Amino acid sequence: FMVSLPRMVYPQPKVLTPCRKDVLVVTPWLAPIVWEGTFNIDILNEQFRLQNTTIGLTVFAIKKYVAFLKLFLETAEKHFMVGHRVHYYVFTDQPAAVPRVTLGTGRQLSVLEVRAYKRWQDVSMRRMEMISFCERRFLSEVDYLVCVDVDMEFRDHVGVEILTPLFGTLHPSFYGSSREAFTYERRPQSQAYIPKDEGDFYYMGAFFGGSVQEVQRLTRACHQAMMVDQANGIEAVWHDESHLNKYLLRHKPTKVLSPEYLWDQQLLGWPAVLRKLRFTAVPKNHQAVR
Numbered sequence: 095f096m097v098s099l100p101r102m103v104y105p106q107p108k109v110l111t112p113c114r115k116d117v118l119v120v121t122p123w124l125a126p127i128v129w130e131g132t133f134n135i136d137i138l139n140e141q142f143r144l145q146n147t148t149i150g151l152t153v154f155a156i157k158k159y160v161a162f163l164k165l166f167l168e169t170a171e172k173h174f175m176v177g178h179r180v181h182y183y184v185f186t187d188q189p190a191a192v193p194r195v196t197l198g199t200g201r202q203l204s205v206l207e208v209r210a211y212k213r214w215q216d217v218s219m220r221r222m223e224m225i226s227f228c229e230r231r232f233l234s235e236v237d238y239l240v241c242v243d244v245d246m247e248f249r250d251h252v253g254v255e256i257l258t259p260l261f262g263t264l265h266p267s268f269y270g271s272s273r274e275a276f277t278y279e280r281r282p283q284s285q286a287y288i289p290k291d292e293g294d295f296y297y298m299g300a301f302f303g304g305s306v307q308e309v310q311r312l313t314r315a316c317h318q319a320m321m322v323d324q325a326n327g328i329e330a331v332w333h334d335e336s337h338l339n340k341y342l343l344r345h346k347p348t349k350v351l352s353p354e355y356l357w358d359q360q361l362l363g364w365p366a367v368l369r370k371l372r373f374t375a376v377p378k379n380h381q382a383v384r
């Protein structure tokens with residue numbers, strides 16, 4: 095049951111004077127695409143707080159990537175779901191290397207010890223297995239799961255505007271690209287295969303989520319697809335991201351996040367279309383850190 099919102103005073107939405115004219119703000123299957131200027135966060139905060147929403151955030155910090163946790167968590171404290179209940183789940187091979195970060199009220203962190211795979215590709219891909227079935231606490235502990243890369247920092251608000259049964263995030267390198275340029279898996283022998291005449295968007299492996307049920311469905315399906323591929327002696331070109339893309343093509347997300355939500359300023363600057371940079375890549379040496 096969902097109670098009434100209280101009286102609220104805010105600017106009237108204007109039917110004939112749209113928020114954003116420069117970007118697509120709804121997909122052809124009527125999922126909102128979340129950009130600054132499309133939402134009133136006060137209304138959304140009310141809706142979600144009235145449901146006592148708890149958000150789980152999973153993050154993997156395997157081997158050298160433990161180095162990224164301090165900034166990741168400190169900035170999450172400033173910017174991620176502030177005012178709501180948050181449960182961080184840090185999956186790591188080094189529980190003792192997890193920094194002691196001070197958390198605001200209603201926020202908690204659990205350290206989950208996992209095995210470290212040799213290949214970075216396997217570390218990245220096996221997140222699907224580890225999230226899916228391996229973890230059973232999620233259903234009892236949180237309402238939504240948000241699954242992100244650790245080599246990142248929050249720079250601005252990331253809040254309940256993202257919550258929905260199933261969401262993906264537009265990859266910052268491809269949001270203006272034609273589908274033929276998307277780096278989908280193109281080999282028909284892979285479960286991740288998408289031909290050149292299919293595809294809505296290229297979604298980023300670094301930021302997806304939804305209800306616990308929908309995230310566990312997605313992660314289970316991607317894990318099983320990866321197992322089929324492995325048996326067939328094929329590894330998809332972009333690993334978990336390739337499978338995520340196939341899944342979201344066939345199971346349309348109920349919101350899509352704009353690249354505000356996954357940006358790389360070093361690589362891509364700050365184009366006019368982005369009013370905020372919310373969650374951004376932390377520069378790293380790929381060869382050294384892996």
Ligand SMILES: O=c1ccn([C@@H]2O[C@H](COP(=O)(O)OP(=O)(O)O)[C@@H](O)[C@H]2O)c(=O)[nH]1
Pocket residue numbers: 153154155156157158159160214217218242243244245300383384
């Ligand atoms: O040695 C590794 C390799 C990968 N990861 C995890 O897998 C995610 C995806 O890998 P990475 O960030 O290297 O991919 P990229 O963003 O460079 O495409 C990382 O954010 C970590 O959460 C990790 O913990 N240790």
Ligand SMILES: [Mn+2]
Pocket residue numbers: 243244245300
């Ligand atoms: Mn990353």
